[PDB]
């Protein structure tokens, strides 16, 4: 509860998960393998995400049941906003991994994946246009973790932490030389994007649950049946 906005940022930045590599083999071509590459990558990041969540200010103060609940709800959102962030300097491309750069044409390798691909690209283009900063990014990502499953005594504690992150975002924008009107506007723009990230996640859950029936790791199956 007691940390400077500068102390909030440095803590989040230091807690940032590493950028993992894919098992993508350029000698290889298929729909099954390309899906396997994404799901395997989206299984190893989860292990890091879980440990990242524990370093998010206020998350450790929650009960185990509440921690499990927030992660089960937001894990895909957190993965997606990370992907979108990594792909900022790569127009029209999604950087799943340093050795795995994909465009919307390669997203056509899987049925119904092109729709999710375009939405992720549009989100990445949005951050690029807004010139999203890393300090703002780690704030947004922590907001997702605490907000996505808060409705579905410890409630206002999360809200108090969320209010602190909002103050941090404003503190960052004020340091960039933005006027009060500009701070409020940029704050609104960033949070409206979270609505789109939620939408992409929901569609992602549908397409992923559909693939499970078609026939993924055990941990990823726990998240799906959640």
């Amino acid at each position: 509860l007691s940390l400077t906005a500068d102390q909030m940022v440095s803590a989040l930045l230091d807690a940032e998960p590493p950028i993992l590599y894919s098992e993508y083999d350029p000698t290889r071509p298929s729909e099954a393998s390309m899906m396997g590459l994404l799901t395997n990558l989206a299984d190893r990041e989860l292990v890091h995400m879980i440990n990242w969540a524990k370093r998010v200010p206020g998350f450790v103060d929650l009960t185990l049941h509440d921690q499990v609940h927030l992660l089960e709800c937001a894990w895909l959102e957190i993965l997606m906003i990370g992907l979108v962030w990594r792909s900022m300097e790569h127009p029209g491309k999604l950087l799943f991994a340093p050795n795995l750069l994909l465009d919307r044409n390669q997203g056509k390798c899987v049925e119904g994946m092109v729709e999710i691909f375009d939405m992720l690209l549009a989100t990445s283009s949005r951050f690029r246009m807004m010139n999203l900063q890393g300090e703002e990014f780690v704030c947004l990502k922590s907001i997702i973790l605490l907000n996505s499953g808060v409705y579905t005594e410890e409630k206002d504690h999360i809200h108090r932490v969320l209010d602190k992150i909002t103050d941090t975002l404003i503190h960052l924008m004020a340091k960039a030389g933005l006027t009060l009107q500009q701070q409020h506007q940029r704050l609104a723009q960033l949070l409206l994007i979270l609505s789109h990230i939620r939408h992409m996640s929901n569609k992602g859950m549908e397409h992923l649950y559909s693939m499970k029936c078609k026939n993924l790791s055990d941990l990823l199956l726990e998240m799906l049946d959640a």
Binding site: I50, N51, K54, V68, E72, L219, E222
Partner: peptide, 9 residues
Amino acid sequence: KILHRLLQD
């Protein structure tokens, strides 16, 4: 409860 185990570790 793999998620619970990894959270406890």
